[PDB]
């Protein structure tokens, strides 16, 4: 996260760290959506251009964390993966369209002050909140700048950007399964996700029921926090039918 701030303790209890077993390394962010399911970006697990294709046994998820590097004894929970599910139409060849994946844990994780699931949006909440100018919150342990690493979880609030501006900022083909967020150059304030933040959640707090909803997944960006560029997020509600299908079938 670039130009963010340290998270408060328990501020993002759905935050998950995807962790490589060997060598031991942060891979990506992710989010907890129930006691046995974690949501992330497909490109965190599968990206052939970079020879990336992780199997269940390659990874762990670490839940309830604050410190990036410490083993947080008595606080974090480390879970093994039963199975990975990547969207069948994830477009890694072109533009990361449908950049979404689910991971089922071997055992349910116990909730605590530090570990708690985020909500997934219904049609109505999505329609109400996903509007240009409305701000969401992005969190992660990724790089602090384009060209180091944070001591603890970082947070930044960013406004959703109008679709024509998103499209005009890039040569990449944008789809209905993506949205973009970030400040414009003349807006003064800044901030963005960066390498390492991939797969983490873009959340908004509903003013109707005071619950947090995950509207996006950190997907891609050209550089980090560059003027006139924006971060792109997987549109979680647009893909909710696949999410529900996976959980219904394999839950």
């Amino acid at each position: 996260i670039v130009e963010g701030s340290d998270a408060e303790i328990g501020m993002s209890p759905w935050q998950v760290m995807l962790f490589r077993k060997s060598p031991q390394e942060l891979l990506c962010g992710a989010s907890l959506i129930s006691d046995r399911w974690v949501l992330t970006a497909a490109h965190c697990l599968l990206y052939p251009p970079w020879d990336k294709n992780f199997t269940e046994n390659d990874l762990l998820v670490r839940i309830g964390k604050h410190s990036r590097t410490r083993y947080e004894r008595n606080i974090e929970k480390i879970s093994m993966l039963e199975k990975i599910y990547i969207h069948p139409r994830y477009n890694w060849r072109e533009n990361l369209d449908r950049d979404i994946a689910l991971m089922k844990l071997k055992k349910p994780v116990a909730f605590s002050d530090y570990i708690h699931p985020v909500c997934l949006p219904d049609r109505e909440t999505a329609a109400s909140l996903l509007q240009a100018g409305y701000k969401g919150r992005v969190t992660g342990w990724g790089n602090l700048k384009e060209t180091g690493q944070p001591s603890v979880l970082q947070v930044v609030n960013l406004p959703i950007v109008e679709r024509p501006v998103c499209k005009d900022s890039t040569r990449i083909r944008i789809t209905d399964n993506m949205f973009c967020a970030g400040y414009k150059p003349d807006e003064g304030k800044r901030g963005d996700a960066c390498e390492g933040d991939s797969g983490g959640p873009f959340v908004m707090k509903s003013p109707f029921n005071n619950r947090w909803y995950q509207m996006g997944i950190v997907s891609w960006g050209e550089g980090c926090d560059r003027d006139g560029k924006y971060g792109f997020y997987t549109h979680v509600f647009r893909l909710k039918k696949w999410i529900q299908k996976v959980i219904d079938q394999f839950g």
């Binding site: 501020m11 708690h116 985020v118 707090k205 005071n210």
Partner: peptide, 28 residues
């Protein structure tokens, strides 16, 4: 879960985090 999105150290105790008001203020 029925309890999703309500944080134990914040919503459940009626405590607000340092920047959530910025979000609310943007929902015009």
């Amino acid at each position: 879960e029925a309890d999703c999105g309500l944080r134990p150290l914040f919503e459940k105790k009626s405590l607000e985090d340092k920047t959530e008001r910025e979000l609310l203020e943007s929902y015009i």
